[PDB]
């Protein structure tokens, strides 16, 4: 089997992407944030504290003939941005882009933190990291991909995120019309539960490529690109007036600037992030200070190849016995 679903930016800045997911019988369609940096599929639901729902589409298990309470199971998750959610668990039928998993753990939110409430466009998250990170207790549950894997034509999914435009998540096949040149594959460590890999270096604009190993995670659920402070300083030093602001919480730059591109290494291959991808607009409405799309990972504890990086590529998440990541230009 295979599946293919369109993923759509939630706003003009590509702060995140939502993908429609069918849950239950009859189908309840929710727009979920596919997150290769976590491993819980959780949704706004009929059980979510009323004051914490503001515009989201909710899953109502009692209206699904295939929903079953996973007795005793609870979940609770906290993300790198400080947001969180928690609740109980049903199993139900979940389909993505024509691909159906029966018996999927659907984690029903009783509580969500303010960040989720305030984002009316995201009805929940669908985790695609490794199932070892799943938070369901006392019986850990599998991700959608993990459950689908054996049935898939090939044990892979691909992320093809758009810049200011829709893209595609495919399951079980590689669309060879969706990228240019070749796909360069690189080793993955699953030791932290993430799609963790080592970039071979970087370049700023038309500058020379610096060979240096940068360990990081491929994370569709993080907006920006988070790299070591040395690397980020080297980038913003090429932008007149750019500075790191503790008050804002990162590098800002004059909105009048033309940003240089950023290149990262995948083995001997190179992925180029156009400068425009790194512009996340005024820090506040009407400001002439703009927020940078490349930020320091110092004090995150890990480097993160978020959407800024991934949307410049066609990315293969290979869930073979020995997992790997593949990157192609597009």
UniProtKB/Swiss-Prot annotation:
Sorted UniProt keywords: Aspartyl protease, Disulfide bond, Hydrolase, Protease, Signal, Zymogen
Active site: 35, 199
Domain of life: Eukaryota
Domain Peptidase A1: 17-328
Catalyzed reactions per annotation: Hydrolysis of proteins with specificity similar to that of pepsin A, prefers hydrophobic residues at P1 and P1', but does not cleave 14-Ala-|-Leu-15 in the B chain of insulin or Z-Glu-Tyr. Clots milk
EC number: 3.4.23.22
Coiled-coil stretches: none
Major enzyme class: hydrolase
Any GO BP: proteolysis
GO terms for MF: aspartic-type endopeptidase activity
Cystine pairs: 255-290
Family of the protein in this entry: Belongs to the peptidase A1 family.
The protein's name: Endothiapepsin
Organism: Cryphonectria parasitica (Chestnut blight fungus)
Residues of the whole record sequence present: 90 to 419 of 419
